[PDB]
């Protein structure tokens, strides 16, 4: 355990011994905490168009979409439960692109175990719950896969009220 670079997240609570979390925009997070690691909830093709995805390459000046495009030229498309780690540009040192799965496209729920997996191999993660908005998983269930896999220090960011509290309420209650 060192200090290491500074991450300077503010305001947490914490769920269990390393899930923590706040009722907060990622991007806003990102640029105020500069973190070693964001988490985007990508797509296997890494194109940014909606969501987490399409707030942080805004954020990023398109930098991230021109990163990726050059990235999936080389690699092809990720695998659904995998990621890759490329520039965190003007956000964070690096950004951990995750492919959870889309179940409103038919993708397997379980392996959301596998996208949380990819957080392990960093100390400390800004990020967003998985899997949620058009990929259709259970929020609360996202967040129970989470604190079930990640044993490394993930700092969750989650910007609507309401969901936050149902988060929270599924913790402490």
């Given at each position: 355990?060192?200090?290491?670079?500074?991450?300077?997240?503010?305001?947490?609570?914490?769920?269990?011994?390393?899930?923590?979390?706040?009722?907060?925009?990622?991007?806003?997070?990102?640029?105020?905490?500069?973190?070693?690691?964001?988490?985007?909830?990508?797509?296997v093709?890494?194109?940014?168009?909606?969501?987490?995805?399409?707030?942080?390459?805004?954020?990023?000046?398109?930098?991230?979409?021109?990163?990726?495009?050059?990235?999936?030229?080389?690699?092809?498309?990720l695998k659904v439960g995998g990621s890759c780690?490329?520039?965190?540009?003007?956000?964070?040192?690096?950004?951990?692109?995750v492919v959870?799965?889309?179940?409103?496209?038919?993708?397997?729920?379980?392996l959301?175990?596998s996208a949380?997996?990819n957080?392990?191999?960093?100390?400390?993660?800004?990020?967003?719950?998985?899997?949620?908005?058009?990929?259709?998983?259970?929020?609360?269930?996202?967040?129970?896969?989470?604190?079930?896999?990640?044993?490394?220090?993930?700092?969750?960011?989650?910007?609507?009220?309401?969901?936050?509290?149902?988060?929270?309420?599924?913790?402490?209650?």
């Open positions: 355990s060192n200090a290491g670079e500074v991450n300077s997240f503010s305001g947490y609570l914490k769920l269990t011994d390393n899930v923590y979390i706040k009722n907060a925009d990622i991007v806003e997070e990102a640029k105020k905490v500069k973190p070693t690691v964001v988490v985007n909830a990508a797509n093709y890494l194109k940014h168009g909606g969501g987490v995805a399409g707030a942080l390459n805004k954020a990023t000046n398109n930098a991230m979409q021109v990163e990726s495009d050059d990235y999936i030229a080389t690699n092809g498309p780690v490329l520039s965190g540009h003007n956000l964070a040192k690096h950004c951990l692109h959870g799965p889309n179940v409103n496209k038919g993708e397997d729920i379980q959301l175990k949380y997996e957080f392990n191999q960093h100390e400390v993660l800004l990020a967003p719950l998985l899997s949620a908005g058009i990929f259709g998983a259970d929020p609360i269930h996202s967040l129970r896969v989470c604190v079930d896999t990640v044993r490394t220090n993930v700092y969750l960011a989650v910007f609507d009220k309401n969901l936050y509290d149902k988060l929270v309420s599924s913790f402490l209650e």
